[PDB]
Amino acid sequence: MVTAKKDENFSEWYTQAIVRSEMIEYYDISGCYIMRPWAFHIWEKVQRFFDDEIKKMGVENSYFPMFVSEVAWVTHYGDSPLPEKIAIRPTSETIMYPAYAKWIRSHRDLPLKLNQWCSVVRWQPTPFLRTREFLWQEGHTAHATEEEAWELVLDILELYRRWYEECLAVPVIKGEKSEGEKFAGGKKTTTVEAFIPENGRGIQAATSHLLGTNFAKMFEIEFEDEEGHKRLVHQTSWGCTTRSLGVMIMTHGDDKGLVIPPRVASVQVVIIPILFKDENTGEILGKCRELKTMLEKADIRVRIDDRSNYTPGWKYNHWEVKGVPLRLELGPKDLAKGTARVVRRDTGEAYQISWADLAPKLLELMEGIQRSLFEKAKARLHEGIEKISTFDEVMPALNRKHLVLAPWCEDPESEEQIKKETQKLSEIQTGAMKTLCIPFDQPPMPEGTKCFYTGKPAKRWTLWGRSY
Amino acid sequence: MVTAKKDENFSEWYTQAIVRSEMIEYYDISGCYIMRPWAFHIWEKVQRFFDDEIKKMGVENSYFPMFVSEVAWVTHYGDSLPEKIAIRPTSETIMYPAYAKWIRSHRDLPLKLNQWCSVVRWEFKQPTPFLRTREFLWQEGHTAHATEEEAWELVLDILELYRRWYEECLAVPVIKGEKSEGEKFAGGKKTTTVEAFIPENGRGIQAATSHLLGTNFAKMFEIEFEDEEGHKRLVHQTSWGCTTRSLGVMIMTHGDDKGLVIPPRVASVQVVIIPILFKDENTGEILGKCRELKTMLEKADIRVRIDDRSNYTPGWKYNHWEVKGVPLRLELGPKDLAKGTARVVRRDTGEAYQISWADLAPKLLELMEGIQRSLFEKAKARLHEGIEKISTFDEVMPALNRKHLVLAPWCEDPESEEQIKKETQKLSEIQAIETGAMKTLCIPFDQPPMPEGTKCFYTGKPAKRWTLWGRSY
Ligand SMILES: [Cl-]
Ligand SMILES: [Cl-]
Ligand SMILES: [Cl-]
Ligand SMILES: [Cl-]
Ligand SMILES: [Cl-]
Ligand SMILES: [Cl-]
Numbered sequence A: 001m002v003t004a005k006k007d008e009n010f011s012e013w014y015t016q017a018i019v020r021s022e023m024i025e026y027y028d029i030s031g032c033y034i035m036r037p038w039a040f041h042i043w044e045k046v047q048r049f050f051d052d053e054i055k056k057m058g059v060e061n062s063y064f065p066m067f068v069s070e071v072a073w074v075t076h077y078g079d080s081p082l083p084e085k086i087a088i089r090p091t092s093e094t095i096m097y098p099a100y101a102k103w104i105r106s107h108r109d110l111p112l113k114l115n116q117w118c119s120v121v122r123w124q125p126t127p128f129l130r131t132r133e134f135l136w137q138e139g140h141t142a143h144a145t146e147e148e149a150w151e152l153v154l155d156i157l158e159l160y161r162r163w164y165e166e167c168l169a170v171p172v173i174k175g176e177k178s179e180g181e182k183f184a185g186g187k188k189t190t191t192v193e194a195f196i197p198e199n200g201r202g203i204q205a206a207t208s209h210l211l212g213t214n215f216a217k218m219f220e221i222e223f224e225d226e227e228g229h230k231r232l233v234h235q236t237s238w239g240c241t242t243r244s245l246g247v248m249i250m251t252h253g254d255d256k257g258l259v260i261p262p263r264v265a266s267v268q269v270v271i272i273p274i275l276f277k278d279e280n281t282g283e284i285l286g287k288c289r290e291l292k293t294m295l296e297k298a299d300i301r302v303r304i305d306d307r308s309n310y311t312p313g314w315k316y317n318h319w320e321v322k323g324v325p326l327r328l329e330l331g332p333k334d335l336a337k338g339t340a341r342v343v344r345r346d347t348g349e350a351y352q353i354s355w356a357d358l359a360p361k362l363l364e365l366m367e368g369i370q371r372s373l374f375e376k377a378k379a380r381l382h383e384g385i386e387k388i389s390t391f392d393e394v395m396p397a398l399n400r401k402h403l404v405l406a407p408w409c410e411d412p413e414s415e416e417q418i419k420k421e422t423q424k425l426s427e428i429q430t431g432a433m434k435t436l437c438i439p440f441d442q443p444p445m446p447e448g449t450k451c452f453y454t455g456k457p458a459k460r461w462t463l464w465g466r467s468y
Numbered sequence B: 001m002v003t004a005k006k007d008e009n010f011s012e013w014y015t016q017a018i019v020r021s022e023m024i025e026y027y028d029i030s031g032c033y034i035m036r037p038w039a040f041h042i043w044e045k046v047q048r049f050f051d052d053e054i055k056k057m058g059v060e061n062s063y064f065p066m067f068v069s070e071v072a073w074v075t076h077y078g079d080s081l082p083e084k085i086a087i088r089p090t091s092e093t094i095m096y097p098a099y100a101k102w103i104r105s106h107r108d109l110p111l112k113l114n115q116w117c118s119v120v121r122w123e124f125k126q127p128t129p130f131l132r133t134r135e136f137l138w139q140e141g142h143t144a145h146a147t148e149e150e151a152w153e154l155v156l157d158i159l160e161l162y163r164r165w166y167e168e169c170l171a172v173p174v175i176k177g178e179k180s181e182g183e184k185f186a187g188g189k190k191t192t193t194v195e196a197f198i199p200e201n202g203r204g205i206q207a208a209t210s211h212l213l214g215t216n217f218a219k220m221f222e223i224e225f226e227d228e229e230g231h232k233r234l235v236h237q238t239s240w241g242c243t244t245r246s247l248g249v250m251i252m253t254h255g256d257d258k259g260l261v262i263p264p265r266v267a268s269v270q271v272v273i274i275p276i277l278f279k280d281e282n283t284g285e286i287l288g289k290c291r292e293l294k295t296m297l298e299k300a301d302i303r304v305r306i307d308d309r310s311n312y313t314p315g316w317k318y319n320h321w322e323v324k325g326v327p328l329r330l331e332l333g334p335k336d337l338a339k340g341t342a343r344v345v346r347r348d349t350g351e352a353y354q355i356s357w358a359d360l361a362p363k364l365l366e367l368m369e370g371i372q373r374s375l376f377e378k379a380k381a382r383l384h385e386g387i388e389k390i391s392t393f394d395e396v397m398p399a400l401n402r403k404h405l406v407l408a409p410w411c412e413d414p415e416s417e418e419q420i421k422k423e424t425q426k427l428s429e430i431q432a433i434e435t436g437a438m439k440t441l442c443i444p445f446d447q448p449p450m451p452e453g454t455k456c457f458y459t460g461k462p463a464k465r466w467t468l469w470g471r472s473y
């Protein structure tokens, strides 16, 4: 059972929700966690979804060593030292890019498209959101042209929007990072941003980089043009991590614990046979098994919780804290009437559905729930963004736990100034406010509109806020 | 092109085939390889098949951390770490303290976990991709049950999946069996196995294992639960794993002198379309029909690739896809455009078929089935031809020298195995003068009859069970 209130002690509510739903287990190296089936199976769903979509695009998977010759060093084995100290892979570029130079010779070798599903390590932790060790996906492509490369960068970004909005039901905002927030080696970084109302922080959801040609020049990734001319390749890289799970929990969770969007739920309907005195139990258990079969033929994912060592009441709370969307109760009365009682997790509403009507009615409720979760979350995000024009509007907005959309000249130096300044003021009253992205969806920029900070001509509207 | 002959130069053969098929790239750290798609997608398909099957059993996936508090130590970050930390040696050290916390009552049982991941084994000797590597991919399962009976049952269920992984997906025949006391897992009580055979060097190779760990691990980590009557019991555990070795085994089993032969059930591309074009001839007539034929074939779920690359001849493409072991090649030339047919070539036998465009999808599904059945049947016939049923130790060296295994009546005494290993190691060296040790591979589940007085082929003590021996990987 979850006792901490989401809107009162947020970090405590969160720890409760993930721990009490059996998603994680804690561990003696800080920033490292055991990922349990309840969390891992949800990751399987999005992984499957993304994997299928990238295969449609002709992307292939592969696996690279975790060892190369910033860095973390394996220097000893036992007590004997290593004749050469071997590095754990800091980043994949080190290995993939030499290999790309050797595999690419002609335009006939392009585009080259590889992805990896693996875990990675980094070196003040929060489960899912910021960990020393996570699962992710990372893709690296090589093209003959920038247009082709750029088209892939956006296609992936669109898949990341889908992963969040279609699967996780989390609304996200597409945009470019500032010069100071993009990948430093790369030409151009696109991103997806989410928002956590309860502490008003923005959080980067996934990223898709147009890397251009620097790494190609650096690793001599070169190809023969159709006319026989030596050209550099145009590269992209992209990734999305198990952070996405964090955001989903934080977005849809309520006081009773997890709420899982049907489209990614391991168990969509849990069936709970009510036993009170042992005269009707056989018929009841038998019916449930039939309903499971009937529902499964409609692609519904179902688990009968017929464990005899637990009460009906214990089962409700259990499947509620785990966030199963739909609970179906079948007791002696329900059996006699030919019906089942169904309760949605998002709202608590209960329905009495007759056996024949069950598949279509559950299919429909799940769509209702999935959509309802997203729209509620979308409404919240819009409610958390304040359009503003002057810097003095900023601190009052951040105290409302809101983000801000403001006209900015896009001067990198101004962004550092803005970071420092907002940090400084937040202390008097980290607290810093930084660019989250410059949205693809730009409102109009009336002529002569000034940057909200420097007074100079504003170039574009920028999403700002406190951040993870 | 592959230049080494599979039975004359087996190792060289194997090395050419994996590289020229573009299954792997080489890497500056020895025993470490990049696994390119042609290889990795075969891993993807077996993983899918296996992961579907264990979910039906209630096994659930999880992810345990790669680092911990014979070990490889990470000591610095840049130029510098306070506690020297370690790449996870086995998974038991992290997993079993967690099982100890998770298990308290009979209601918590059974507990069935699995992990898909990469592993580092630091000691490898001489490196060969899929066979002897620093890093590999695997799955490892770990369960815990109220009774030994239930766990044992799970062990055998898992072993059955391992037979299916090999025989159904990779068309590799295997033999289920019990390991001997000296070949089993040290700490466990019973260990079952799935063995394969490599005709070209006469070696057996362990394909996968499923262990009845019993309770000694429970005792060591204090994984106890309370009985349904309040008594503290130790859990009965299992574990089981299957690695990328499965692929090296598939490679060895079906390959021939032109290169790889990949079973249609796991081939990344099942049907390569090869437009009979030359440089700057393209008029769209050939590519056009090729694309239509592709679309038509994917409507029957055939995995299809057109090789439209402009700067290679058809002959070079024929060889390139043969080396890669694509099961089926479909050739579309001007002549075929004129006759309303395609010519398709079976990779496994060379046999060619003239097939009319409308017959292609049903005739190709049928061919792929046949290729899949044939690969298994021919490997199974080879497997049973490689096994000699014997009565005494004398018949041993001659059989080893025919690159075969032996099936012998054995008393199962653990010291005899160590002896049988030494003697054969010694006799092999004698011949080298003018490696070689023979061990138990398994005690097969499938027991032929055992007449009343039958003696142990080596000690003369009365024999207990028939036992499969051979030289080994
Ligand atoms: Cl938090
Ligand atoms: Cl899935
Ligand atoms: Cl990346
Ligand atoms: Cl924070
Ligand atoms: Cl070999
Ligand atoms: Cl194991």
Ligand SMILES: [Cl-]
Pocket (backbone or CB within 6 Å): B264, B265, B368, B369, B372
């Ligand atoms: Cl088939």
